[PDB]
Design a protein around this motif. Structure first.
Motif, PDB file in Angstrom:
ATOM      1  N   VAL A 105       8.420  10.449  -7.101  1.00 25.58           N
ATOM      2  CA  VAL A 105       8.203  11.731  -6.437  1.00 25.58           C
ATOM      3  C   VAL A 105       7.950  11.438  -4.960  1.00 25.58           C
ATOM      4  O   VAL A 105       7.539  10.329  -4.598  1.00 25.58           O
ATOM      5  CB  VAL A 105       6.999  12.496  -7.042  1.00 25.58           C
ATOM      6  CG1 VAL A 105       7.284  12.954  -8.472  1.00 25.58           C
ATOM      7  CG2 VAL A 105       5.698  11.685  -6.981  1.00 25.58           C
ATOM      8  N   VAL A 121       1.769   4.929   0.805  1.00 26.39           N
ATOM      9  CA  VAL A 121       1.273   5.832   1.827  1.00 26.39           C
ATOM     10  C   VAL A 121       2.087   7.131   1.782  1.00 26.39           C
ATOM     11  O   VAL A 121       3.179   7.197   1.205  1.00 26.39           O
ATOM     12  CB  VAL A 121       1.329   5.204   3.232  1.00 26.39           C
ATOM     13  CG1 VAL A 121       0.483   3.942   3.343  1.00 26.39           C
ATOM     14  CG2 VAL A 121       2.781   4.941   3.679  1.00 26.39           C
ATOM     15  N   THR A 140       0.846  -1.191   0.000  1.00 26.75           N
ATOM     16  CA  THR A 140       0.000   0.000   0.000  1.00 26.75           C
ATOM     17  C   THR A 140       0.887   1.248   0.000  1.00 26.75           C
ATOM     18  O   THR A 140       1.627   1.485   0.958  1.00 26.75           O
ATOM     19  CB  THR A 140      -0.924   0.023   1.229  1.00 26.75           C
ATOM     20  OG1 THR A 140      -1.727  -1.164   1.230  1.00 26.75           O
ATOM     21  CG2 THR A 140      -1.758   1.286   1.355  1.00 26.75           C
ATOM     22  N   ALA A 175      12.521   0.160  -0.757  1.00 25.04           N
ATOM     23  CA  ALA A 175      12.357   1.185  -1.773  1.00 25.04           C
ATOM     24  C   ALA A 175      12.115   2.512  -1.062  1.00 25.04           C
ATOM     25  O   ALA A 175      11.576   2.528   0.046  1.00 25.04           O
ATOM     26  CB  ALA A 175      11.125   0.853  -2.620  1.00 25.04           C
ATOM     27  N   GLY A 176      12.434   3.617  -1.751  1.00 24.41           N
ATOM     28  CA  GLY A 176      11.999   4.932  -1.293  1.00 24.41           C
ATOM     29  C   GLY A 176      12.903   5.504  -0.191  1.00 24.41           C
ATOM     30  O   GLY A 176      13.872   4.870   0.249  1.00 24.41           O
ATOM     31  N   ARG A 212       0.579  12.764  -9.309  1.00 19.38           N
ATOM     32  CA  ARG A 212       1.199  12.752 -10.629  1.00 19.38           C
ATOM     33  C   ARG A 212       0.416  13.689 -11.555  1.00 19.38           C
ATOM     34  O   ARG A 212      -0.711  14.073 -11.249  1.00 19.38           O
ATOM     35  CB  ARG A 212       1.425  11.336 -11.182  1.00 19.38           C
ATOM     36  CG  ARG A 212       2.200  10.429 -10.237  1.00 19.38           C
ATOM     37  CD  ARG A 212       2.720   9.184 -10.935  1.00 19.38           C
ATOM     38  NE  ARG A 212       3.188   8.198  -9.967  1.00 19.38           N
ATOM     39  CZ  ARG A 212       4.408   8.185  -9.438  1.00 19.38           C
ATOM     40  NH1 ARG A 212       5.352   8.989  -9.905  1.00 19.38           N
ATOM     41  NH2 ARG A 212       4.683   7.353  -8.451  1.00 19.38           N
ATOM     42  N   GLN A 270      10.169   7.644 -13.081  1.00 24.46           N
ATOM     43  CA  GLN A 270      10.133   8.838 -12.261  1.00 24.46           C
ATOM     44  C   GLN A 270       9.447   8.529 -10.933  1.00 24.46           C
ATOM     45  O   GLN A 270       8.326   8.026 -10.917  1.00 24.46           O
ATOM     46  CB  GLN A 270       9.374   9.950 -12.996  1.00 24.46           C
ATOM     47  CG  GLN A 270       9.314  11.265 -12.228  1.00 24.46           C
ATOM     48  CD  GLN A 270       8.660  12.338 -13.066  1.00 24.46           C
ATOM     49  OE1 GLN A 270       7.432  12.414 -13.164  1.00 24.46           O
ATOM     50  NE2 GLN A 270       9.471  13.182 -13.688  1.00 24.46           N
ATOM     51  N   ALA A 282       6.504  -0.477 -10.876  1.00 26.51           N
ATOM     52  CA  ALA A 282       5.633   0.370 -10.080  1.00 26.51           C
ATOM     53  C   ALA A 282       6.283   0.656  -8.723  1.00 26.51           C
ATOM     54  O   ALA A 282       6.131   1.738  -8.178  1.00 26.51           O
ATOM     55  CB  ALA A 282       4.282  -0.284  -9.946  1.00 26.51           C
ATOM     56  N   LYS A 299       9.928  16.564  -4.046  1.00 28.54           N
ATOM     57  CA  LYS A 299      11.189  16.052  -4.580  1.00 28.54           C
ATOM     58  C   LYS A 299      10.902  15.047  -5.691  1.00 28.54           C
ATOM     59  O   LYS A 299       9.800  14.485  -5.767  1.00 28.54           O
ATOM     60  CB  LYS A 299      12.032  15.376  -3.487  1.00 28.54           C
ATOM     61  CG  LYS A 299      11.354  14.202  -2.776  1.00 28.54           C
ATOM     62  CD  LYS A 299      12.195  13.593  -1.652  1.00 28.54           C
ATOM     63  CE  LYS A 299      11.583  12.339  -1.055  1.00 28.54           C
ATOM     64  NZ  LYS A 299      12.319  11.906   0.152  1.00 28.54           N
ATOM     65  N   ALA A 349       6.971  13.585  -0.870  1.00 28.34           N
ATOM     66  CA  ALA A 349       6.219  14.666  -0.260  1.00 28.34           C
ATOM     67  C   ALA A 349       6.362  14.539   1.255  1.00 28.34           C
ATOM     68  O   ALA A 349       6.577  13.438   1.744  1.00 28.34           O
ATOM     69  CB  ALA A 349       4.760  14.535  -0.653  1.00 28.34           C
ATOM     70  N   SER A 409       4.524   1.363   1.806  1.00 24.92           N
ATOM     71  CA  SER A 409       5.705   2.005   1.260  1.00 24.92           C
ATOM     72  C   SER A 409       5.378   3.478   1.106  1.00 24.92           C
ATOM     73  O   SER A 409       4.335   3.828   0.532  1.00 24.92           O
ATOM     74  CB  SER A 409       6.118   1.461  -0.096  1.00 24.92           C
ATOM     75  OG  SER A 409       7.168   2.271  -0.644  1.00 24.92           O
ATOM     76  N   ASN A 410       6.301   4.320   1.580  1.00 25.66           N
ATOM     77  CA  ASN A 410       6.206   5.729   1.308  1.00 25.66           C
ATOM     78  C   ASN A 410       6.082   5.898  -0.206  1.00 25.66           C
ATOM     79  O   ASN A 410       6.653   5.103  -0.951  1.00 25.66           O
ATOM     80  CB  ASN A 410       7.417   6.486   1.859  1.00 25.66           C
ATOM     81  CG  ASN A 410       7.268   7.973   1.637  1.00 25.66           C
ATOM     82  OD1 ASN A 410       7.874   8.520   0.725  1.00 25.66           O
ATOM     83  ND2 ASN A 410       6.412   8.624   2.419  1.00 25.66           N
ATOM     84  N   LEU A 411       5.346   6.921  -0.667  1.00 22.59           N
ATOM     85  CA  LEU A 411       5.119   7.100  -2.098  1.00 22.59           C
ATOM     86  C   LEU A 411       6.433   7.348  -2.848  1.00 22.59           C
ATOM     87  O   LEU A 411       6.472   7.154  -4.068  1.00 22.59           O
ATOM     88  CB  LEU A 411       4.100   8.229  -2.367  1.00 22.59           C
ATOM     89  CG  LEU A 411       4.614   9.672  -2.281  1.00 22.59           C
ATOM     90  CD1 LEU A 411       3.551  10.637  -2.776  1.00 22.59           C
ATOM     91  CD2 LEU A 411       4.999  10.083  -0.847  1.00 22.59           C
ATOM     92  N   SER A 412       7.511   7.738  -2.138  1.00 16.41           N
ATOM     93  CA  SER A 412       8.807   7.945  -2.772  1.00 16.41           C
ATOM     94  C   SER A 412       9.373   6.642  -3.341  1.00 16.41           C
ATOM     95  O   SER A 412      10.277   6.698  -4.176  1.00 16.41           O
ATOM     96  CB  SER A 412       9.807   8.556  -1.792  1.00 16.41           C
ATOM     97  OG  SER A 412      10.058   7.660  -0.732  1.00 16.41           O
ATOM     98  N   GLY A 413       8.841   5.482  -2.896  1.00 21.70           N
ATOM     99  CA  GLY A 413       9.275   4.182  -3.385  1.00 21.70           C
ATOM    100  C   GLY A 413       8.509   3.722  -4.637  1.00 21.70           C
ATOM    101  O   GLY A 413       8.881   2.724  -5.255  1.00 21.70           O
ATOM    102  N   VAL A 414       7.454   4.474  -5.017  1.00 23.09           N
ATOM    103  CA  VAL A 414       6.652   4.162  -6.199  1.00 23.09           C
ATOM    104  C   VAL A 414       7.273   4.887  -7.400  1.00 23.09           C
ATOM    105  O   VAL A 414       7.863   5.950  -7.243  1.00 23.09           O
ATOM    106  CB  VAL A 414       5.175   4.572  -5.975  1.00 23.09           C
ATOM    107  CG1 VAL A 414       4.287   4.335  -7.207  1.00 23.09           C
ATOM    108  CG2 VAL A 414       4.587   3.857  -4.774  1.00 23.09           C
ATOM    109  N   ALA A 415       7.153   4.308  -8.597  1.00 19.39           N
ATOM    110  CA  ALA A 415       7.627   4.984  -9.794  1.00 19.39           C
ATOM    111  C   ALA A 415       6.553   4.918 -10.885  1.00 19.39           C
ATOM    112  O   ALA A 415       5.715   4.011 -10.910  1.00 19.39           O
ATOM    113  CB  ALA A 415       8.935   4.372 -10.272  1.00 19.39           C
TER     114      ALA A 415
END
Lengths: 279, 278, 278, 277, 277
Positions: free
Chosen positions: E137, A33, A31, D139-140, B22, E135, D62, E67, E139, E32-38
């Motif tokens: 990002v 977050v 998830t 990750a992250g 995004r 990419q 992802a 970032k 926050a 996962s913090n969104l910084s780990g998503v691409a």
């Protein structure tokens, strides 16, 4: 009840979830977050006339989510000023932060850590009417305990203010004053200076006594008094005692445990004996 | 009761506690907060002058293991907020206390708990309140983190660790040493290891009616080398002494060891002890 | 079994494990806790005097890879809590042990695990318990973080690292150096690199029946310059020696190198070695 | 179905939450960063010397994989390799750990740089009867603000202390050229004292005749004569007619030091020194 | 519809959780913090010198982007740029990385300041046959408390260490004016010794006649005569009738130093010094 542009993936059994797949075969899920500090609310997008202000209604920090801090972003086609303000009564406001917002330049405040009960943004437009304006507000809360991994030492640096020539500024020197005798009327050893890290001692002898003799002593390991020699400041006389006064004597005291300035004799007044020890 | 927020729906009409992100708003993220950011209102009942509110003891032990607690008090009159702990939920000790001024939101620090039960107790001052709220946050757990190595961390020192904008250091070391204690006959005695000292003061004392002490250093070869000391009373310089009740100063920088050998002694005993200083 | 909490509903009547926030309560956030803040009650069965509770071995390997464990014990009589590990779930070693006093909540530290299986073992002391609970928290993983550079971090030193409110430092450096070892014939020998030293003690010793050593420094040009030393036994000052079984002290501040040249030697060998000090 | 059961709220709604607070009337969702999750890669027992090779795992997706960690347990010894590849064909070894018989063995977190990662496990000289291999990925990176209230306690490497004291270096040295191959009289360059207490000056060259005068400057900026001590014979003077010699000066308190060539004939002269704190 | 499957609890309820504890009777949500998503931005192969330009991404929204980070993989070399714009029209480059052929290449995290961000990738002199650009990002910022139990191990910059020792500076210096262009007799200003051990005093000016007397004060506050050493000839004295000279003093142990003009005729006199620890 509007539908957005993102779509939740489905698992093997067709169940939707706010997750992303991972691992080589995409057979695990996680998830995504974000701490609430990464979320923003748009406070206003209404263009202001010249000199006109936007004032957010006071926001109570007290609630199910205890707001600890706030941050703002402003974008406008003309210059203005953003204020972050606080109030304990939601009536009288003090300014905690203020940032100039240049025309056509996204401008952010710092995180402001709050202390009063209520916070607000107040934005004052400058001398030209805006045609475009947005103001965003993020808040945070709470504090997580973390354990820093011990594997790698942390690299540290010192402030430009704490270095000089690429070296850390240190002070190794210690100084203390000491009273051997104050207005002594009769012969005695007086108080014993504990050497404790000092290497050098300056001793002043002064008072009304018409006649006096001071004998200079150190103590080492045995505790017996040992005669020591001082150097008088005015004429560089070296001696282990003095019949004089209104004079100062310099001693090298490295290695001694204590220093004693004994009044051997005194008549016709009093005598003070005091010094300064330096490492 | 329904609240004022509304969950967004995805493209397929499925609700989620998410926000889009995004450029094309085609990704989603769940906003979260550690439980330490959540608060419970404990009371909003106005107290009479001198009246206390006492929370019932809260057991830390449960599915969520409470590690810490923090409080906020707001009242229209002054009072005092206490955070307290108990191992038996009967006798209470105060862990923290804060004065609460009239009309001023007042927060405690995070208090890290050790006993089994915690509570807030608020004692109103000499004027009856017309408005009062008391909020309580709790936290739990500890996460392992790896600190990004890219930029060194900037550090500074307490006002209490600096002086002129300079870090206070102590470079000096001192140690005492026994070469001889109540020696009855000739010997070399114990060898001082110089180990970072630069200066040595040696006292010679005892009942011996006659004695000779010879001053030695050892350097790299391990052979004894004669050294000179300076007597404190008269600045005599010598490499030995026939005297006692006297002290000799030595510059010992560069030596490995210092030995104060009793060459001879009759008619009593002799101690030889010193202090070495960097 | 239903619990005492109730999920709030959004505007559309959808339940969620969220809290509202912002002035108008029109935003939502999910309260979370890392699993390290969760606990399981292992037992609440009172033990007889000397009786032990032994948890069955817990396998760390699974979908959640357990990295660490922490325990809390509360009992009305004293006992001992052990955290133990095993690679075969049969033979156990103790990783940590804490004494648990009567009526005092007692926590272990976080214990970072290495073997496959972990367990708690609690041994009751010489008095039967009437009340006992034992809780266990586990954690997993490690998050990368970037520390904000805005404010320098305040640092503090151990009571162990200070004295008199000052950081204990060591400013003295010392090194030994061989100019010559058992030299049989004339040569310059090795050149000491001064590198931060201010003072040098040089010993000349060996079997040579005759020798001459000349004392040299080099500065910026690289030309040899005569330097003067002070002999330890008698304070002779000279820029060379015909002697041996002696040591010479030099002030070497400002020089780049020091050379102790054997000009001549007959009838044996000669070593020349020293100790340089800052 | 597993052994856990989601609790129900007051209204009978299930949630992946735990209750808390004295009255158990609040709820919290237990979470774990994905770095705390593991996948079992294999539990197939290997013959003597046989290897297990995971198919190359693409970091790009992802979830952008930044790091990997492994755990191995086997009844016989072997070796676990963590490996990386930019083409999913040629592999380089980033980490290797020996796995003893019957001992759970973990790698460190390995931070990845190439596109693909894999584990490769090579069994030793004895056939396994029991083997599991687990893999975690992360990750992250989260931005954090460290609480300023309490100083952090810090300690120094065994390598940075001695006798329980921090090893420091207080001495500074710099070299300086007053004159290089001077052909005629001049003041030459002025040394900035800047923290030095001691100066050694060498005078050397071909000049058949030369005179160097020793100067300091203090607050006024006027040149003041200073005295040096010659290394070979401890002569003290404020000038020299000699060369192939070095002069030591106490320069504490001066702003600048100047070594002026007053006169020179029949060659050149260099004047250079080393200043030390 | 993907390859993962949500487990069911005891009551058959699905959840995005994993079981844990020995008996698998507890649950936790992997996050996962969104910084780990691409996001994959493009996989379209570029001709020689052709550029890919992402449309400007607005940072302002429900998620406030702070970032960005990128990863590029191509079979031929190129350059990845991270760029920013306040108007989504004129772009400045914030970071740039060379991307070698067949080598996964990452930028650092780039902390953003303008309203819009984008990636722009410029292919080099050979047409690509394979290309992907990802990419991530981030926050937000979380307040954390670093555990007080264990000291942190710390290390110093290569720039602050030498020979395994921390470089320190223990020496302090200050200038002081006792008298400036004094026209008549007076004590002048008193130097506070404050940590200095050594003092160099310069006496200079137009005065045709003057006398300066050297004083220290210790604990009593009475002036005590002190002796200085003149730099030019090593004369030791407790006063001077001269000028254009400098006097060195050992001042350790004194509280103040006074350079009194006892008399002056026919001009003015300055008396200034430098104190050093």
């Amino acid at each position: 009840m509007v539908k957005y542009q993102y779509e939740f993936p489905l698992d093997k059994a067709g169940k939707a979830g706010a997750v992303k797949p991972y691992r080589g075969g995409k057979n695990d899920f996680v998830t995504p977050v974000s701490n609430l500090s990464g979320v923003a609310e748009i406070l206003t997008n209404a263009a202001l006339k010249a000199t006109e202000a936007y004032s957010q209604l006071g926001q109570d920090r007290l609630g199910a989510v205890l707001i600890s801090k706030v941050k703002g972003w402003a974008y406008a086609d003309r210059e203005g000023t953003l204020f972050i303000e606080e109030s304990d009564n939601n009536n009288v406001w003090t300014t905690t932060a203020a940032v100039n917002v240049a025309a056509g330049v996204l401008t952010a405040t710092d995180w402001v850590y709050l202390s009063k009960r209520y916070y607000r943004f107040r934005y004052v437009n400058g001398n030209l009417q805006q045609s475009e304006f947005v103001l965003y507000q993020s808040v945070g809360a709470g504090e997580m305990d973390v354990r820093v991994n011990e594997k790698t030492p942390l690299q540290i640096d010192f402030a430009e203010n704490q270095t000089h020539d690429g070296r850390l500024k240190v002070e190794a020197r210690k100084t203390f004053d000491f009273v051997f005798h104050e207005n002594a009327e009769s012969a005695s050893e007086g108080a014993a200076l504990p050497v404790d890290g000092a290497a050098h001692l300056l001793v002043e002898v002064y008072g009304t006594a018409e006649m006096s003799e001071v004998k200079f002593w150190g103590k080492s390991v045995s505790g017996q008094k040992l005669p020591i020699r001082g150097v008088k400041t005015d004429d560089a006389t070296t001696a282990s005692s003095t019949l004089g006064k209104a004079e100062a004597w310099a001693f090298d005291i490295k290695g001694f445990k204590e220093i004693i300035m004994e009044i051997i004799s005194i008549t016709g007044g009093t005598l003070s004996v005091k010094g300064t020890a330096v490492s």
